[PDB]
mmCIF file of C-alpha atoms and ligand atoms in Angstrom:
data_model
loop_
_atom_site.group_PDB
_atom_site.id
_atom_site.type_symbol
_atom_site.label_atom_id
_atom_site.label_comp_id
_atom_site.label_asym_id
_atom_site.label_seq_id
_atom_site.Cartn_x
_atom_site.Cartn_y
_atom_site.Cartn_z
ATOM 1 C CA UNK O 896 155.372 97.233 288.082
ATOM 2 C CA UNK O 897 158.595 99.187 289.177
ATOM 3 C CA UNK O 898 160.993 101.260 287.385
ATOM 4 C CA UNK O 899 160.354 104.989 287.253
ATOM 5 C CA UNK O 900 163.706 106.443 288.496
ATOM 6 C CA UNK O 901 163.570 109.388 286.428
ATOM 7 C CA UNK O 902 160.072 110.533 287.347
ATOM 8 C CA UNK O 903 160.927 113.264 290.036
ATOM 9 C CA UNK O 904 163.940 114.490 288.184
ATOM 10 C CA UNK O 905 162.105 117.198 286.065
ATOM 11 C CA UNK O 906 164.152 116.610 282.866
ATOM 12 C CA UNK O 907 161.526 116.086 280.202
ATOM 13 C CA UNK O 908 159.644 113.212 278.333
ATOM 14 C CA UNK O 909 160.354 111.748 274.910
ATOM 15 C CA UNK O 910 157.862 109.917 272.551
ATOM 16 C CA UNK O 911 159.157 107.489 270.278
ATOM 17 C CA UNK O 912 157.777 104.296 268.449
ATOM 18 C CA UNK O 913 159.326 100.914 268.270
ATOM 19 C CA UNK O 914 158.752 98.135 265.537
ATOM 20 C CA UNK O 915 160.542 94.617 265.187
ATOM 21 C CA UNK O 916 160.235 92.476 262.409
ATOM 22 C CA UNK O 917 161.702 89.167 263.339
ATOM 23 C CA UNK O 918 162.057 87.430 259.816
ATOM 24 C CA UNK O 919 164.129 90.598 258.703
ATOM 25 C CA UNK O 920 165.784 91.207 261.980
ATOM 26 C CA UNK O 921 164.752 95.067 261.475
ATOM 27 C CA UNK O 922 164.340 97.499 264.374
ATOM 28 C CA UNK O 923 162.763 100.606 263.596
ATOM 29 C CA UNK O 924 162.946 103.677 265.941
ATOM 30 C CA UNK O 925 161.155 106.783 265.057
ATOM 31 C CA UNK O 926 161.706 109.891 267.357
ATOM 32 C CA UNK O 927 158.444 111.577 267.539
ATOM 33 C CA UNK O 928 158.771 114.554 269.879
ATOM 34 C CA UNK O 929 159.982 115.550 273.164
ATOM 35 C CA UNK O 930 158.398 117.911 275.843
ATOM 36 C CA UNK O 931 158.954 119.628 278.945
ATOM 37 C CA UNK O 932 162.677 119.683 278.282
ATOM 38 C CA UNK O 933 164.898 121.104 281.029
ATOM 39 C CA UNK O 934 166.473 124.528 279.928
ATOM 40 C CA UNK O 935 170.265 124.279 279.148
ATOM 41 C CA UNK O 936 171.012 127.571 277.785
ATOM 42 C CA UNK O 937 171.658 130.756 279.996
ATOM 43 C CA UNK O 938 168.813 133.338 279.156
ATOM 44 C CA UNK O 939 167.323 130.992 276.798
ATOM 45 C CA UNK O 940 165.986 127.391 276.250
ATOM 46 C CA UNK O 941 167.575 124.549 274.660
ATOM 47 C CA UNK O 942 168.597 123.434 271.078
ATOM 48 C CA UNK O 943 167.534 119.687 271.558
ATOM 49 C CA UNK O 944 168.694 116.921 269.419
ATOM 50 C CA UNK O 945 168.280 112.927 270.030
ATOM 51 C CA UNK O 946 170.786 110.167 269.849
ATOM 52 C CA UNK O 947 169.942 106.809 269.461
ATOM 53 C CA UNK O 948 172.431 103.765 270.590
ATOM 54 C CA UNK O 949 172.219 100.166 270.097
ATOM 55 C CA UNK O 950 173.984 98.529 272.869
ATOM 56 C CA UNK O 951 174.828 95.113 274.206
ATOM 57 C CA UNK O 952 177.114 94.189 277.073
ATOM 58 C CA UNK O 953 178.170 97.731 277.782
ATOM 59 C CA UNK O 954 179.318 98.381 274.265
ATOM 60 C CA UNK O 955 177.803 100.987 272.061
ATOM 61 C CA UNK O 956 177.430 99.085 268.521
ATOM 62 C CA UNK O 957 175.676 101.539 266.403
ATOM 63 C CA UNK O 958 174.999 105.472 267.067
ATOM 64 C CA UNK O 959 172.378 107.435 265.107
ATOM 65 C CA UNK O 960 171.212 111.179 265.643
ATOM 66 C CA UNK O 961 168.457 113.332 264.915
ATOM 67 C CA UNK O 962 168.504 116.913 263.259
ATOM 68 C CA UNK O 963 168.812 119.854 265.751
ATOM 69 C CA UNK O 964 165.686 121.891 266.515
ATOM 70 C CA UNK O 965 166.484 125.540 267.760
ATOM 71 C CA UNK O 966 165.209 127.287 270.739
ATOM 72 C CA UNK O 967 162.504 125.079 272.048
ATOM 73 C CA UNK O 968 161.630 122.719 275.059
ATOM 74 C CA UNK O 969 159.077 121.041 273.099
ATOM 75 C CA UNK O 970 160.644 119.800 269.833
ATOM 76 C CA UNK O 971 159.016 117.560 267.237
ATOM 77 C CA UNK O 972 161.127 115.304 265.061
ATOM 78 C CA UNK O 973 159.341 112.491 263.248
ATOM 79 C CA UNK O 974 162.595 111.005 262.169
ATOM 80 C CA UNK O 975 162.973 107.394 261.563
ATOM 81 C CA UNK O 976 165.948 105.074 262.168
ATOM 82 C CA UNK O 977 166.558 101.503 261.561
ATOM 83 C CA UNK O 978 168.643 98.935 263.032
ATOM 84 C CA UNK O 979 169.688 94.998 262.052
ATOM 85 C CA UNK O 980 169.045 92.850 265.173
ATOM 86 C CA UNK O 981 168.762 89.073 264.496
ATOM 87 C CA UNK O 982 165.668 87.475 266.262
ATOM 88 C CA UNK O 983 168.054 85.304 268.267
ATOM 89 C CA UNK O 984 169.681 88.630 269.930
ATOM 90 C CA UNK O 985 166.523 90.950 270.176
ATOM 91 C CA UNK O 986 166.120 90.026 273.856
ATOM 92 C CA UNK O 987 169.723 91.033 274.560
ATOM 93 C CA UNK O 988 170.149 94.421 273.286
ATOM 94 C CA UNK O 989 169.333 97.979 274.479
ATOM 95 C CA UNK O 990 168.025 100.837 272.620
ATOM 96 C CA UNK O 991 169.233 103.957 274.437
ATOM 97 C CA UNK O 992 167.594 107.356 273.716
ATOM 98 C CA UNK O 993 169.434 110.477 274.865
ATOM 99 C CA UNK O 994 168.135 113.989 274.637
ATOM 100 C CA UNK O 995 171.037 116.514 274.193
ATOM 101 C CA UNK O 996 171.511 120.235 273.942
ATOM 102 C CA UNK O 997 173.576 121.350 270.964
ATOM 103 C CA UNK O 998 176.087 123.942 271.603
ATOM 104 C CA UNK O 999 178.144 125.489 268.854
ATOM 105 C CA UNK O 1000 181.219 125.233 271.107
ATOM 106 C CA UNK O 1001 181.810 122.879 273.805
ATOM 107 C CA UNK O 1002 180.709 119.214 274.556
ATOM 108 C CA UNK O 1003 176.913 118.923 273.900
ATOM 109 C CA UNK O 1004 175.361 118.193 277.392
ATOM 110 C CA UNK O 1005 172.734 115.570 277.966
ATOM 111 C CA UNK O 1006 169.461 116.699 279.339
ATOM 112 C CA UNK O 1007 168.534 113.046 279.957
ATOM 113 C CA UNK O 1008 168.241 109.544 278.771
ATOM 114 C CA UNK O 1009 166.155 106.373 278.962
ATOM 115 C CA UNK O 1010 166.839 102.672 277.615
ATOM 116 C CA UNK O 1011 164.547 99.990 276.474
ATOM 117 C CA UNK O 1012 165.270 96.354 276.100
ATOM 118 C CA UNK O 1013 167.243 94.025 278.199
ATOM 119 C CA UNK O 1014 167.440 95.015 281.780
ATOM 120 C CA UNK O 1015 164.846 97.555 281.194
ATOM 121 C CA UNK O 1016 162.088 98.130 283.865
ATOM 122 C CA UNK O 1017 158.857 99.688 284.130
ATOM 123 C CA UNK O 1018 157.287 101.560 281.328
ATOM 124 C CA UNK O 1019 160.656 100.947 279.514
ATOM 125 C CA UNK O 1020 160.165 97.276 279.735
ATOM 126 C CA UNK O 1021 156.455 97.665 278.799
ATOM 127 C CA UNK O 1022 157.211 99.336 275.474
ATOM 128 C CA UNK O 1023 159.842 96.734 274.630
ATOM 129 C CA UNK O 1024 157.622 93.929 275.327
ATOM 130 C CA UNK O 1025 154.784 95.474 273.578
ATOM 131 C CA UNK O 1026 157.090 95.694 270.419
ATOM 132 C CA UNK O 1027 158.030 92.171 270.724
ATOM 133 C CA UNK O 1028 154.453 90.911 271.383
ATOM 134 C CA UNK O 1029 153.410 92.453 268.388
ATOM 135 C CA UNK O 1030 155.690 91.726 265.244
ATOM 136 C CA UNK O 1031 155.586 94.189 262.506
ATOM 137 C CA UNK O 1032 153.213 96.798 264.489
ATOM 138 C CA UNK O 1033 154.807 100.222 265.278
ATOM 139 C CA UNK O 1034 154.053 100.957 269.152
ATOM 140 C CA UNK O 1035 154.472 104.586 270.192
ATOM 141 C CA UNK O 1036 155.016 105.493 273.980
ATOM 142 C CA UNK O 1037 156.156 108.168 276.033
ATOM 143 C CA UNK O 1038 159.081 107.915 278.399
ATOM 144 C CA UNK O 1039 160.386 110.054 281.254
ATOM 145 C CA UNK O 1040 164.061 111.217 280.726
ATOM 146 C CA UNK O 1041 166.458 110.252 283.645
ATOM 147 C CA UNK O 1042 169.926 111.491 284.476
ATOM 148 C CA UNK O 1043 172.905 110.179 282.497
ATOM 149 C CA UNK O 1044 174.627 109.199 285.796
ATOM 150 C CA UNK O 1045 171.968 106.716 286.513
ATOM 151 C CA UNK O 1046 171.235 105.342 283.361
ATOM 152 C CA UNK O 1047 174.592 104.873 282.384
ATOM 153 C CA UNK O 1048 175.420 103.128 285.665
ATOM 154 C CA UNK O 1049 172.758 100.524 284.690
ATOM 155 C CA UNK O 1050 174.303 100.234 281.046
ATOM 156 C CA UNK O 1051 177.833 99.686 282.061
HETATM 157 CA CA1 CA P 1041 173.963 124.728 276.645
HETATM 158 CA CA1 CA P 1042 172.318 125.204 273.273
#
């Protein structure tokens, strides 16, 4: 129950898999696809890419990013990323997933973001809990993107 703050924001959705291997402390995130993204270019669509942050206690510990897909609101990525998180800390971290529009000049604006892990709620918490309940098993799930203002207030 609960969560769902981004549902009516109409920013789009992201699908990714999570896998956690406790013995090795290996956390794998595969960015699969996004859909229904907000348009971010005047006269056009968006040039989306995805950033992943590992966080704890308001600090960005590690940063990864996908390739950029041009001129689409429904990008497919299928790009894998791994992090090292010891089992004693896996219930105390966040994985933050942000979709942004690439612009050749100017700060790349976020479309929206979500996080899973500590302090996550709703479908975000469910995905994380499913990951932890099933060591070594990759679990794919869709998430609704939420405005950065809101998500960042929860992460800070
Ligand atoms: Ca733009
Ligand atoms: Ca752009």
